[PDB]
Amino acid sequence: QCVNLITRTQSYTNSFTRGVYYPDKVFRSSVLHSTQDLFLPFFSNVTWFHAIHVSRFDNPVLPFNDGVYFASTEKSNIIRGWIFGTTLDSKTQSLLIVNNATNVVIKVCEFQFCNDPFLDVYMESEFRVYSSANNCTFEYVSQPFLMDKNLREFVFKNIDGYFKIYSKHTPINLGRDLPQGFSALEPLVDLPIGINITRFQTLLALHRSYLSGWTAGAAAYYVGYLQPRTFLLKYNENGTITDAVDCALDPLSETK
Amino acid sequence: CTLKSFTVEKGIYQTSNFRVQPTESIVRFPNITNLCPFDEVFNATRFASVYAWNRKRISNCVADYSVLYNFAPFFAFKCYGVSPTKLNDLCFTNVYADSFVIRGNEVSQIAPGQTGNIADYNYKLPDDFTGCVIAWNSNKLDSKVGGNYNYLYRLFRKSNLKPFERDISTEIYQAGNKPCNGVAGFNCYFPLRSYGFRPTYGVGHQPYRVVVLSFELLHAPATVCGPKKSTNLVKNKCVNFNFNGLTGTGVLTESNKKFLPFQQFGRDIADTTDAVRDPQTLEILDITPCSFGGVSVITPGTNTSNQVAVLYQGVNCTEVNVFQTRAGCLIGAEYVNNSYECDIPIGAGICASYQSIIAY
Amino acid sequence: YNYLYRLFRKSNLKPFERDISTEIYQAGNKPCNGVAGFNCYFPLRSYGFR
Numbered sequence: 172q173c174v175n176l177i178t179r180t181q182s183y184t185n186s187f188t189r190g191v192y193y194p195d196k197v198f199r200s201s202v203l204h205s206t207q208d209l210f211l212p213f214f215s216n217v218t219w220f221h222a223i224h225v226s227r228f229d230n231p232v233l234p235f236n237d238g239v240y241f242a243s244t245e246k247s248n249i250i251r252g253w254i255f256g257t258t259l260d261s262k263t264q265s266l267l268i269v270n271n272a273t274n275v276v277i278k279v280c281e282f283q284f285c286n287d288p289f290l291d292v293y294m295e296s297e298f299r300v301y302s303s304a305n306n307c308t309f310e311y312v313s314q315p316f317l318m319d320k321n322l323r324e325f326v327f328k329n330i331d332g333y334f335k336i337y338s339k340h341t342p343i344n345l346g347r348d349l350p351q352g353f354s355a356l357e358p359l360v361d362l363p364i365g366i367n368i369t370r371f372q373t374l375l376a377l378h379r380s381y382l383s384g385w386t387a388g389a390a391a392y393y394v395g396y397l398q399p400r401t402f403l404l405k406y407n408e409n410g411t412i413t414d415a416v417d418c419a420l421d422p423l424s425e426t427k
Numbered sequence: 428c429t430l431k432s433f434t435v436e437k438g439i440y441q442t443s444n445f446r447v448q449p450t451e452s453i454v455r456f457p458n459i460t461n462l463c464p465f466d467e468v469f470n471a472t473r474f475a476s477v478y479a480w481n482r483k484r485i486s487n488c489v490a491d492y493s494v495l496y497n498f499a500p501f502f503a504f505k506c507y508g509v510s511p512t513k514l515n516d517l518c519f520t521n522v523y524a525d526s527f528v529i530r531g532n533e534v535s536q537i538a539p540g541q542t543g544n545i546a547d548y549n550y551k552l553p554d555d556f557t558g559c560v561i562a563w564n565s566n567k568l569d570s571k572v573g574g575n576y577n578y579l580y581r582l583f584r585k586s587n588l589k590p591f592e593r594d595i596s597t598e599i600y601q602a603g604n605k606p607c608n609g610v611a612g613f614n615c616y617f618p619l620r621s622y623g624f625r626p627t628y629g630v631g632h633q634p635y636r637v638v639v640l641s642f643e644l645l646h647a648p649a650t651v652c653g654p655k656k657s658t659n660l661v662k663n664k665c666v667n668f669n670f671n672g673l674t675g676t677g678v679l680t681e682s683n684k685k686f687l688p689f690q691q692f693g694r695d696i697a698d699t700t701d702a703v704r705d706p707q708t709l710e711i712l713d714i715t716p717c718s719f720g721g722v723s724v725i726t727p728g729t730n731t732s733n734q735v736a737v738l739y740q741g742v743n744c745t746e747v748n749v750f751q752t753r754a755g756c757l758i759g760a761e762y763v764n765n766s767y768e769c770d771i772p773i774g775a776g777i778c779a780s781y782q783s784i785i786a787y
Numbered sequence: 788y789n790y791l792y793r794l795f796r797k798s799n800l801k802p803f804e805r806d807i808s809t810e811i812y813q814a815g816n817k818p819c820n821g822v823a824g825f826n827c828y829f830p831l832r833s834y835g836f837r
């Protein structure tokens with residue numbers, strides 16, 4: 172039941188100082204800690220994707236590189252998860268992350284993914300996400316991380332067998348979607364997956380019309396790519412990352 | 428001994444290091460929950476036939492062999508490649524549980540290097556099998572007076588089975604030269620024969636339920652590991668602590684530091700652990716290392732006297748003629764309110780002299 | 788089957804130490820009391836040399 176329904180346009184914006192996450196689970200108070208990790212660089216070129224379904228294949232699979240920064244100002248029901256893998260077919264293992272109103276299901280199987288995967292609500296069906304799923308080796312159901320103006324930021328990393336997901340929800344006063352200031356991303360899950368991930372794709376939800384089989388919809392999201400970078404994070408009295416400098420951005424920050 | 432001489436000149440000599448020995452070991456390992464469903468496999472109401480033996484993969488849970496040991500009816504608990512005693516500590520990546528029902532006489536056939544009907548045609552183990560075989564009597568669950576005809580086995584097959592292979596085919600066995608054409612008769616037999624279990628059979632023929640646990644390691648990180656015992660928590664003493672694989676030795680005092688929910692450990696400015704969150708009860712503890720000190724010996728010349736005093740540098744007097752100085756705890760010298768010139772320097776304005784040994 | 792090895796022992800041996808004691812080992816919570824039976828096995832097993 173693989174059908175091509177989503178068209179996607181792309182623009183380029185500035186990251187500002189978004190995308191900082193907690194590099195470990197260690198409490199540090201009132202210190203300056205320099206860490207080298209996969210970070211989204213400050214004021215980096217971030218691609219803003221507008222995905223529109225109106226009631227041909229124009230929604231290609233994006234590379235994963237060393238990890239992905241994802242952001243959205245949209246509500247929790249439109250964007251419903253992601254797809255990770257290399258070939259996205261039955262010959263290699265793949266990871267499917269699907270969120271719904273009650274929980275999140277993260278599941279690693281041999282999915283034969285569709286070219287234009289989307290979750291359709293009618294109850295929710297994954298037959299437009301994949302056509303088959305065999306030799307399934309991992310399943311993990313837990314509390315959802317797309318809950319309810321609110322900017323939602325995620326960091327996906329695939330390091331030495333573990334798929335690490337970091338997240339944050341920030342109430343942004345009406346204005347520029349990527350705001351100024353700092354909001355560090357808390358560690359959400361470390362999954363013992365052990366698969367090769369080189370490509371990724373975003374899952375959207377489409378509603379049946381009951382009257383052009385699916386209702387017309389739009390989703391805007393920001394994608395940036397993590398790079399091996401050294402950051403200097405400021406930990407305040409209560410252990411919160413309130414500020415950071417990118418060591419390789421400019422000579423002043425390099426001096427810092 | 429330190430000065431490598433039999434005569435010691437007057438002065439203070441740093442000779443040893445005082446330490447507070449660890450008293451207890453506190454191994455607060457992570458809260459053990461979500462153990463592997465061995466109750467589903469071993470205590471199932473319905474098992475499978477040996478030709479269509481049931482295989483369940485086991486991953487991402489706490490392997491636990493306590494339950495197996497508790498069960499008394501087991502006729503064989505023979506293990507291959509790993510010891511039964513060290514099942515709970517040595518850990519593996521995937522565990523395969525194979526369940527079936529056979530007759531008692533054939534339980535010896537469930538082993539590497541064996542031959543028989545079950546080994547050749549129903550269930551074969553490789554010669555390098557790493558795992559355990561478990562079998563138990565099941566008269567109360569699998570024997571019927573009329574005869575239980577729901578358990579089957581494969582008696583005829585063209586070639587022997589490969590290790591960890593199943594055959595659920597119902598093709599008529601062609602033993603001769605003529606084609607069977609799907610109809611039984613002479614030289615054409617149905618391969619699956621029924622295990623007609625009855626309660627009055629001899630011990631070699633009563634139904635035995637067998638579960639074979641096969642352990643495998645791959646390049647993936649091993650995620651089926653046995654429970655690590657979490658002992659009670661002791662505070663305010665020098666105890667060797669093992670918290671979630673982070674090891675050390677120190678006092679665990681109450682902490683006023685409010686950790687965020689995602690944080691587990693805590694570090695100093697100089698990247699040394701100063702705090703930790705207990706994984707059993709969500710409380711914050713101030714890890715403070717046990718007291719240590721530089722033991723210094725204050726003595727006059729051996730020509731004059733053999734009396735000595737001991738200074739524990741940096742050690743409070745309650746943690747070891749006992750006097751408390753800012754330098755440390757001085758034992759063996761009596762404080763005198765008189766002031767004299769410095770003879771043996773102690774520190775922080777305190778000096779020692781011989782007149783007994785006095786400190787002033 | 789003339790060559791036997793000690794599969795089970797309470798503790799590891801010392802260097803250049805020989806153990807020839809044919810006493811039973813307790814592998815479980817239940818005591819064995821010197822008699823073989825369920826989950827009570829002899830420590831010394833023979834090699835199947837062919």
Ligand SMILES: *[C@@H]1O[C@H](CO)[C@@H](O[C@@H]2O[C@H](CO)[C@@H](O)[C@H](O)[C@H]2NC(C)=O)[C@H](O)[C@H]1NC(C)=O
Nearest residue numbers: 269270271272273274275276294295296312313
């Ligand atoms: C949201 O997703 C969860 C996860 O699949 C659904 O919960 C499952 O529902 C099925 C119904 O067939 C049950 O068999 C499972 O036991 C449920 N699993 C868990 C972990 O609860 C849930 O129904 C979904 N909700 C909606 C509205 O689609």
Ligand SMILES: *[C@@H]1O[C@H](CO)[C@@H](O)[C@H](O)[C@H]1NC(C)=O
Nearest residue numbers: 182183184185214215216217
């Ligand atoms: C971002 O990339 C696009 C093309 O990928 C380029 O045209 C644009 O100049 C870049 N933005 C900046 C600020 O350099």
Ligand SMILES: *[C@@H]1O[C@H](CO)[C@@H](O)[C@H](O)[C@H]1NC(C)=O
Nearest residue numbers: 261262281304305306307308
């Ligand atoms: C994958 O599935 C196919 C059939 O679905 C099977 O033949 C193959 O052995 C399976 N591989 C693994 C590693 O499970």
Ligand SMILES: *[C@@H]1O[C@H](CO)[C@@H](O)[C@H](O)[C@H]1NC(C)=O
Nearest residue numbers: 256257258366367368369370
């Ligand atoms: C992961 O997949 C890519 C693309 O197929 C391949 O080039 C790379 O070598 C793979 N990595 C590993 C470790 O197999």
Ligand SMILES: *[C@@H]1O[C@H](CO)[C@@H](O)[C@H](O)[C@H]1NC(C)=O
Nearest residue numbers: 406407408409410411413685
């Ligand atoms: C830190 O915590 C204290 C007490 O919980 C609170 O009063 C204070 O506002 C917090 N933030 C800073 C920056 O001190």
Ligand SMILES: *[C@@H]1O[C@H](CO)[C@@H](O)[C@H](O)[C@H]1NC(C)=O
Nearest residue numbers: 465466469470494495497498
């Ligand atoms: C089976 O049931 C008994 C009943 O008391 C229970 O003690 C045991 O833990 C269960 N599981 C196994 C694996 O024996």
Ligand SMILES: *[C@@H]1O[C@H](CO)[C@@H](O)[C@H](O)[C@H]1NC(C)=O
Nearest residue numbers: 457458459460706707708709
């Ligand atoms: C940890 O173990 C204790 C033991 O009583 C239990 O009460 C508690 O629910 C467990 N979980 C957490 C998160 O503390």
